[model samples]
Target: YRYTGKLRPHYPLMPTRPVPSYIQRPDYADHPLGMSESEQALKGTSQIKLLSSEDIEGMRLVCRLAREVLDVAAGMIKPGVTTEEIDHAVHLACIARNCYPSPLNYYNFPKSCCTSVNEVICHGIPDRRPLQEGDIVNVDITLYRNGYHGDLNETFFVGEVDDGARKLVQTTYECLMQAIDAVKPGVRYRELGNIIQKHAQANGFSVVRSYCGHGIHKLFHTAPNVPHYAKNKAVGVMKSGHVFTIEPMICEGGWQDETWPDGWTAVTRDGKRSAQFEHTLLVTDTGCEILTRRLDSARPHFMS
Candidate 1:
């Protein structure tokens, strides 16, 4: 599942850690220094609020489009298909539904969909790499429609895979499911990390901490940074009308990860295999509903 390379060292985790050098920052600052005339002009802005009820419904529609696009792209995952070909299918699928491929041109990302093969982790741009047997790849799909966005991803086996890769993929799926089952009205969002981390460690794996799930509805990325580790400081309480994703990136080795030279792709620092599964959920009055669940006939393949 991981790329073939030597492992790197794990970076230390700390509270209020500074952003790494490789990560790009937007013009909007999280905090400001001493205020000058320009800083004063930018001050007094109110915090962005969560999505409204109508906005959530718009997100649901976009999520449905994303699911359909994934279904179509998955069918084309046979051997010898290039990553660019999969991107083409995804682009066409989004266009057919009159939705913009969210990843395309977002922050200068040049691909319709992310095709992370092996140790590439996340954000692997579509290229000429042809998928082969025994390889595991993760397809990340996000769609923008009706002024909202939906995000989800899953790792898949290319043709026949090995037993280790099969277990990794299946366990990662279960980890995300267990985390989803923990969602309910008034449940602490931080507890999702405990559930996911327990399932992953019980199966002898680790959850990547660098990239966790996030609130996705009106914007591609929003508040309430959802971490996938135990006992974190993730904000927000699950209330009715809340919508977010619970994706856990499980790896075969330590939980640490490193960025690729491309500046976008994140790979396991240990160079071990990693797998991920994601779902967009709506916190309902009773409990929660998975908005991106596959149909009954669309079973996942676990072949080794």
Candidate 2:
């Protein structure tokens, strides 16, 4: 299979709508009426927010809710569905769960969920363009609840995909898992990049240079910027209660990316496929816990 040609992004992204005054809104949502940015959840420097026991429990619920929202949007993925429609569904799903869509206005990002299709690396805003057959899309979903934020994303095939696309998706996910498995207390954050980068390069793929993962919890993004390439400069050591994400954005071609005129979308310069997988993790006394891992917990326990 050959690489697909560059897919031009659909632009002129629509503006965000006003949420009801009664609904819970993040500090970034304090626009139309004006509120203090100082008190907003998105505020805070790059310092790591070692979560408290209560904060950990809040993130657990928030992460579970985000997984549900992802499944809702993912179930609708197919040919002939516009990304805007997906964003709408994701937005409503968040509100229905009594959670705020964290991406609504964080730094003026309009869409509720980020839909990066084809060659896009990340931050690809959802638009009116309908996905075509054989296309691949990555939906980034983050929600705020109980004064905390949950972040996660995954790339999905729009329809029938080629062997190359499938490998790209599979490998990117593998990178996330392996990097996660390597997490333990006392390990340096920068060292994880080696594990991700070695696997990606050994498979003949390039690691995305821009837009690394961050410490996420009470703050939308915090300290410990995690670069998914080898020999990165990310500082910080993994300690119990340190919550962050290990999202690897791997590409089939050049790692360099170009942003669309809309100021949000970032696609590969070589116009090759890219895939990403993320999970919010908590460092325990031992390794770590996949807070966003997809699994069922509602099964009955009566076995004769």
Best by TM-score: 2
Alpha-carbon RMSD, each predicted model: 8.8, 5.0
- How would you encode candidate 1's per-residue C-alpha lDDT over 73-116 as one tens digit per residue? 78888789987789888877887787777776565566778888
What's the lDDT for candidate 1?
Answer: 0.75
- Where does candidate 1 stray beyond 4 Å? 1-51, 296-298, 301-304
lDDT of each: 0.75, 0.83
Q: Which stretches of candidate 2 lie over 4 Å from their true place?
A: 1-5, 11-15, 31-46, 297-304
**Cα lDDT of model 2 by residue, 235-299, tens digit:** 78999999999889999998998787777778888888899988899999889988887777431
Distance from true position, residue 235, model 1, in Å? 1.5
